[PDB]
């Protein structure tokens, strides 16, 4: 600064810590599934990365964001409850 205690030292250290074992998952928006696959047919990791909607070499979760009408089973992991509700409301099925 030039004459006083820098803002860095002045302020408190931000609380908390970072885990080393934070197995972060990628995100698939079920609405994006709706517009991407209105025909249903087949859904899976390979197809999603083939479209380029999600990163490779990682597990994916499904969001409750979006109106789902396409009746198709989804091959993926760690669906939220709202994802299962939307999936079975359309008439599809979750994997694990």
């Amino acid at each position: 600064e030039g004459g006083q205690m820098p803002i860095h030292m002045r302020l408190p250290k931000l609380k908390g810590f970072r885990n080393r074992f934070r197995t972060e998952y990628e995100i698939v928006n079920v609405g994006d599934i709706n517009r991407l696959f209105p025909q249903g047919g087949a859904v899976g990791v390979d197809d999603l990365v083939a479209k380029g909607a999600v990163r490779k070499n990682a597990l994916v979760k499904v969001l409750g964001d979006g109106k789902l009408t396409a009746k198709v089973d989804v091959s993926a992991h760690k669906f939220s409850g709202s994802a299962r509700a939307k999936i079975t409301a359309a008439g599809g099925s979750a994997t694990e």
Partner: protein, 62 residues
């Protein structure tokens, strides 16, 4: 050749999902008897960085 990030800045400031920076206020770690629960409520939280120094901070973290 390759940039550096000011460590203390990285250990005090947190960038949010958008273009905002927050500060953990914690003038509440030394002496707390004369400070009431009211003042501690005032300090408690993560307030937004003042716009009179974001223009410096963003280069401190980047």
């Amino acid at each position: 050749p390759k940039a550096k990030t000011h460590s203390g800045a990285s250990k005090r400031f947190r960038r949010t999902g958008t273009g905002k920076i927050v500060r953990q206020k914690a003038n509440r770690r030394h002496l707390l008897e004369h400070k009431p629960s009211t003042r501690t409520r005032r300090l408690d939280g993560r307030t937004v960085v003042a716009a009179n120094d974001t223009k410096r901070v963003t280069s401190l973290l980047n």
